[PDB]
Structures are given as C-alpha cells and as structure tokens.
C-alpha cells in the first residue's frame, strides 16, 4: 500500500493550491484520509478528514478556505485551498492516522511554496579535497549547490553508493532570495587519485539535474 | 476546538536514560482510545509508534511504550538511544454526530545529551569557475562536533569580517550524535582577488583552531 501527493510545487500568492494523494495497492474508499500540513521547522497541523463515509470535517481555521474531496474512478483524495498567502508554505501530507486503528498510511509529503517569484535552477560548483592531504588520514570535500529557487534540491553521492560520512545542509535564503546549501563528505586522504567522487544534485522545479565530478585540485 | 497539551516542548536526555513525554487531553478522546504516538526524525514524515493509547506498532522497538489514565497520555522511552533523536507529537481524535476532529500535540524535541566533541575544520577556497562567474564563495566546515555552540569568524588578511557570511547546521547525527556547521563566506570576484589570506577561525571553549589559505596557492 502507497500514499502519493501530487500537484504543489510553486504556487503564486491569491491562487490555490489542488493537491492529489492517489492510493496504489488499496481502494482510496476503504478508508477515511487526514490532511496535514508542516510549515517549515514548524510543527503539525491538522487541516481536514474524510470519512470512509464521504464527509469532510475541517479543522476551525482551515474551514473557510479548504474543500476536501475524494474521486473513487481515479482512487484520489483532494485537497484544494484557495486565497494562499505566505504563512501556506509547508509540506502537505495526506495520512489515514490511525490514532486507534491499527492501520496507519502516510504519503512523503509535497512541499507547496508560496512566492510569486520564478523557477531558479541551481549552479554546482566543486568543494575541492587537497591533492596532498592537510587533515590525516581523512578528507573532506563537497559540492556547493548555489542560487536556486523554489526548493528543495536533493544531493547524493556516486549515485547513491556513497552515504556514510555525507552531510547535505539544510539550505540558506540568500540576500537575493535564493537558496544556497553545500553537500560535503569525509573520504580516506588516501582514496583520492583512485575512488572518483561525484555529487548529483537534482532540482526537480526546475527539471534540471546536475552530476559533478570533484577532483582534487 | 480539541487540543492535546504536549510537555515538555524538549528536553535533553543522555544515551541509556528513561524519558517521559506527556500529552493531557482536553477532552474525553473518542472513546478514551484515539490516542497515537508519532516521531519525525530530520527531513522525513512523521511514523507512528504507537496507537490505541499502547499498542505498540510490530515495526517499532519495544523501548518505546504508551500509556493513559484520564486525560494524561504518556510516552515513555525505557533507555534512550542516539537513533531516538526526533521530535515526538501525540494525536487525538475526537469523535460525534457532526464532529470529527484531530489534534496533535505541539511536539517535544528530544536532544542527546554526548561528550564534548571538537570539530574537523576544513576550508575551502572558491572554484575557478565560480570566480569567472563574478562571485566568490569560501566556505568553512566544522565536522562531527559538541556542544552546538561555537563561535566561527573570518578574516581576510587579518581583518575581522561583519554581515558577509551566513551559518548553516545540521541536525544531530542518528549514530553519533554530533553536529555539522558551514560557514560561507560570500565576496564579489573583485574583492576576493584584492586579498591573499582567508582564515576561518573556530572557537570553543579554551580551544580557538584557525585554518586558512593564500589565495592562488596549492
């Protein structure tokens, strides 16, 4: 059994959002479904529930804006939430909870931003290790992921094979009002003129991927 | 209108020690049974744990445990471990003819509390492409450290820095337990290139470790 969201992504102030939560493995009418939300760093936030019944159920402050319906021919359930302001931006889930049944099901999420500005694809530039070490036994090195928008970015190492030692931070909101974040990894000091090290950065808003070789300087 | 009060908002606890999270329900829940127990760890969704005030999720380890009596609902962790760093929600659902609500708790941050830890300092100088580009980035890493509190300033030949650069951390490692900091330094190509020595300064407690470069030499 799966949880999908589809839609979200960028969204412009004053419009809505449509969002999609489609059930693979299982009938969408078999259970009843929550939406919640996450503003960034934030806590969680019930917005609706629909009855394996059919009925919609909104939380106080979500009421007059929030409609929340299901299609069984598709098998989805919708979320649609008109007037979005700033205070909007979070990942949105769709979750049956399971507060006292044994079943629970949630999706991964969709992260809608709020923002009236466009879809900036990242520039990838090489955090570069010495050639000659200057730290041991161990290196660091990365890639700096720069001046993108809307997120998120996600990075990986030698395209998944390379997971230990790797810390992807979270990104900053630059003066500019793009995002920036550096992915770095320690390697054995050794291993570098041998093991080839390649960061692959992906910014699905903007359909871009970029693979980066990074070399000792 | 259901509120479920989470206590405390977080706490500190070290690897082994028993921890008690408390939820008071401001309401009969449901049938005083829809109760959970979710954890987020850092960039996932939440999961449950438990359900049904004590049902212990077949997925989850038999540290975890939940209990109810009135309005307070418990979680307790028997003997913490590093991979329990995560924020925990309690959710209630209150059911009626027209009402069928939910609400979780405002969540409880559980830190690991570990020994001090000092930082693998590293710099990095701006690639050559980025510098054609017109912009400089210099950035200064500080790996697998504790506490969180340190102090990273830079200097451009021995001139302290102000409002040029920007902190990014990650959050505490599932396995160890430690931190990682960035500190990016951003100048424009121009003045990147009117300067030779770049030093990232790390200061924590007694100890100050600087690591730095001359621009152009390797």
């Known amino acids: 059994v799966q949880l999908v969201e589809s839609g979200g992504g960028l969204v412009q102030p004053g419009g809505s959002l449509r969002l999609s939560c489609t059930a693979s493995g299982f009938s969408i009418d078999s259970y009843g479904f929550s939406w919640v939300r996450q503003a960034p760093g934030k806590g969680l936030e019930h917005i609706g529930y629909?009855?394996?019944?059919?009925?919609?159920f909104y939380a106080s402050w979500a009421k007059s804006r929030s409609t929340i319906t299901r299609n069984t021919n598709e098998n989805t359930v919708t979320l649609k939430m008109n007037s979005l302001r700033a205070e909007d931006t979070a990942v949105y889930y769709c979750?049956?909870?399971?507060?006292?049944?044994?079943?629970?099901?949630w999706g991964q999420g969709t992260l809608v931003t709020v923002s009236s500005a466009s879809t900036k694809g990242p520039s990838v530039f090489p955090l570069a290790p010495s050639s000659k070490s200057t730290s041991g036994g161990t290196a660091a090195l990365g890639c700096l992921v720069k001046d993108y928008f809307p997120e998120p970015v996600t990075v990986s190492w030698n395209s998944g094979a390379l997971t230990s030692g790797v810390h992807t931070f979270p990104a900053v909101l630059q003066s500019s009002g793009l995002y920036s974040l550096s992915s770095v990894v320690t390697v054995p000091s050794s291993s570098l003129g041998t093991q080839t090290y390649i960061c692959n950065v992906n910014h699905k808003p903007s359909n871009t991927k970029v693979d980066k070789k990074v070399e000792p300087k | 209108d259901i509120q479920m009060t989470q206590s405390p908002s977080s706490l500190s606890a070290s690897v082994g020690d028993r921890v008690t999270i408390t939820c008071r329900a401001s309401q009969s829940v449901w049938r005083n049974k829809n109760v959970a127990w979710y954890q987020q760890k850092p960039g996932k969704a939440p999961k449950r744990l438990i359900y049904?005030?004590?049902s212990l999720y077949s997925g989850v380890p038999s540290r975890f445990s939940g209990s109810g009596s009135g309005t307070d609902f418990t979680l307790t962790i028997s003997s913490l471990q590093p991979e329990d760093f995560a924020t925990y929600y309690c959710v209630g659902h209150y059911g009626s003819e027209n009402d069928a609500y939910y609400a979780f708790g405002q969540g409880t941050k559980v830190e690991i509390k570990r020994t001090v830890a000092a930082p693998s300092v590293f710099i990095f100088p701006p690639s050559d492409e980025q510098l054609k580009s017109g912009t400089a980035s210099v950035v200064c890493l500080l790996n697998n450290f504790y506490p969180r509190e340190a102090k990273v300033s830079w200097y451009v030949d021995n001139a302290l820095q102000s409002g040029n650069s920007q902190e990014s951390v990650t959050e505490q490692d599932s396995k160890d337990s430690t931190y990682s900091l960035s500190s990016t330094l951003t100048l424009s190509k121009a003045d990147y290139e009117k300067h030779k020595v770049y030093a990232c300064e790390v200061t924590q407690g007694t100890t100050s470790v600087t690591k730095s470069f001359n621009r152009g030499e390797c």
């Open positions: 049904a005030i004590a």
């Open positions: 979750a049956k909870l399971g507060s006292g049944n044994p079943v629970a099901i």
């Open positions: 629909l009855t394996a019944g059919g009925r919609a």
